[PDB]
């Protein structure tokens, strides 16, 4: 699902294929380093800091699954764990640096629970700024003091 | 895309297949360690410190994509990041040593933003000497004090 | 046998399939991260801090074996050893942190001897709070000063 | 010759096939982790801290040779050397910890000279408690202050 | 070729099958830990500190080859190198400890050039006491200050 | 190509099969540790510190290739790199100790560029004494202060 969004040879973020859409955090500079994906029609929402595009048939096989079911506990991401409690995601400050946008936070069954956009460093833990689902909806949860990765 | 250019058993640089051409920095000693590629007709420009050759049909599948879209920000390369600002690329002095020619600097979507030729060490940062694109053109940006890798 | 019980993306404990039932410590927040298991009919006992459910035919193959035969000596668990003496289980303080509920303590032949619920830290050793068997019965042994993991 | 004697997944000692019998130190908890060997008829002597069983034809090939010829000097064991003098075996304190029962002490020609049961730590050297041969007999030599391994 | 000579469970030296004979340094206590070899007729020479026995047909396949051709240079042994110069063998003091008798020193083609009996520690180098060949003869070279291993 | 030249069990140098001849530095004591090679007719030149012999048909397959093409740059040898500039070879003082004669210095394509005979230690770099080719000739380059390895 993760496809990197390059900008003049510099990887600036990522783009996941979640379900039937190709998502990419709007704030991220650059184009998707996949020919087919770059050529698509992207719709941009500044509200959700998103910029999605409906996936082509031949890529739907590589499309990941998403979910709203996000019980308190621990999740997985590129940089290890993600504590999830209080409708809030957190990672140990320093695991996520800029350039980590568009990465998915998934459960142990693979399902994508949310997509990182940035994070508010609050001591030992950074409270992640995310794009999450909600009973057939796409919400956006963002903490005060949040940077954009 | 990267194919190493050997010289008497010593790897002296690299050669990327960007788009429909096989590029290789002219200054680099040796031949490409790929049978098919070595046998091609190479045209050499001393202006761009380049020596390209139009890719054979069977290798076009392994051909990478390139781009002029290079917004300020961060890029990826073999040795980590590449700061890109002021129409200038930079890496932390010491990441790129000689023998790193022909390596591509790409964005997060894979697209090749530029190709390293060498670099001018200016303290903590080395300003890279590169071959970059420009709205259907191949330009060459090189800083004063530049060595050839 | 171990299946993790997630709560909003945060793993809060575990659930083992011991024999013909699927056990889970009642105190644990969340749902079992296995589709089939979540959908079952769970009966809850506050007496035993348990919440079991009779296993479906297709999962009985992955069902572990249990036993009352627990002679003094050493047992195995996720975090190494477990001293067992005086009808009491103990682990070196610090091996078991919260989030370790529902984990089994087994013998060298695989049989599950007990299931952790929490533990009373008493110096170098923590005396474990467990669910154990007893000649075709399910007992619960818990020490004073016990926390819930 | 060495076959480990497991007890609830915990290796508690060993069992060697010396000559035509399968020996095992009686004090050791558990069963032999070899199907065929477990099923045999074991005779137990509390005098010699032994529990032998006459070897099956198909295993006699893997049966080791034993000997009474034990001249003063050095012997081999799992944990290096064994000083042998004064009708006494010794190893540097700390080489043999509990769980080392049933291991053989052999000569440079392979012959098994004795079988460890435990040992009396007497400073830098521990004087081993052993089962040894004696002109077609099985004797047992044990020092004061001996533990059982 | 190497077969260990055990003494009451303590390995005291070794025995190599060189050519058509089974050699063993006479000074070594114990019996050969190979049934067939122990049962043979051994002839002992105190002159050569040897005790050879003509090899049985079924073991001749595992018999090693020997040679008198020993040009100055380096040889191989269990404990690395062996300098050979001045009709003298040497190893760095400390490579060979007692219990290393009967070990062969061979060339890069496998041929056994000599058999260790002991050695005279003379500083950084120990000059080995050996049994060597000499145009269809078995000689014995031994340095002043030699111990027996 | 490299075959070691032993002397009384002590490896004193080497012998490479370069092209159609078997070369060996004349100064080296001992015989080649290869039966077939030892039996050949060797011609010795004191001028070139060489002692070559025309290779037998069955060994010509294992014969290496040589070359006069030696452009300034870096070469390979047993002990790493070899700087080559000013018609001179050099290695960092200490890489080549005595006993390194007859070793080849080759290019990245395998071709043997020269054969070491010894070297003049001149500080941090030792300027190698070599046997090199020259448009269908065998020359010998040797620096003042050269030892023989």
From Swiss-Prot, chains A, B, C, D, E, F:
Site positions for Involved in dimerization of the capsid protein? 75, 108
Region annotation Interaction with spike glycoprotein E2: where it falls in the sequence = 43-48
Please tell me which stretches of this chain the record labels as motif Nuclear export signal: 32-42
Give the active-site positions: 27, 49, 101
Q: Where in the cell is it found?
A: Virion; Host cytoplasm; Host cell membrane; Host nucleus
Q: Which residues form the signal peptide?
A: none
Q: Which cysteine pairs make disulfide bonds?
A: 1-16
**Annotated consequence of substituting residue 149 to A/R:** Complete loss of cleavage by capsid protease
Query: Which portions of the sequence form the region Dimerization of the capsid protein?
Result: 71-81, 107-111
Q: Domain Peptidase S3: where?
A: 1-149
Its domain of life?
Viruses
UniProt subunit comment: Homodimer. Homomultimer. Interacts with host karyopherin KPNA4; this interaction allows the nuclear import of the viral capsid protein. Interacts with spike glycoprotein E2. Interacts with host IRAK1; the interaction leads to inhibition of IRAK1-dependent signaling.
The record's domain comment reads: The N-terminus contains a nuclear localization signal and a CRM1-mediated nuclear export signal. The C-terminus functions as a protease during translation to cleave itself from the translating structural polyprotein.
Function (record text): Forms an icosahedral capsid with a T=4 symmetry composed of 240 copies of the capsid protein surrounded by a lipid membrane through which penetrate 80 spikes composed of trimers of E1-E2 heterodimers. The capsid protein binds to the viral RNA genome at a site adjacent to a ribosome binding site for viral genome translation following genome release. Possesses a protease activity that results in its autocatalytic cleavage from the nascent structural protein.
Q: What's the protein called, per UniProt?
A: Capsid protein
Query: What organism is recorded for this protein?
Result: Semliki forest virus (SFV)
Q: What is the lineage of its organism?
A: Viruses, Riboviria, Orthornavirae, Kitrinoviricota, Alsuviricetes
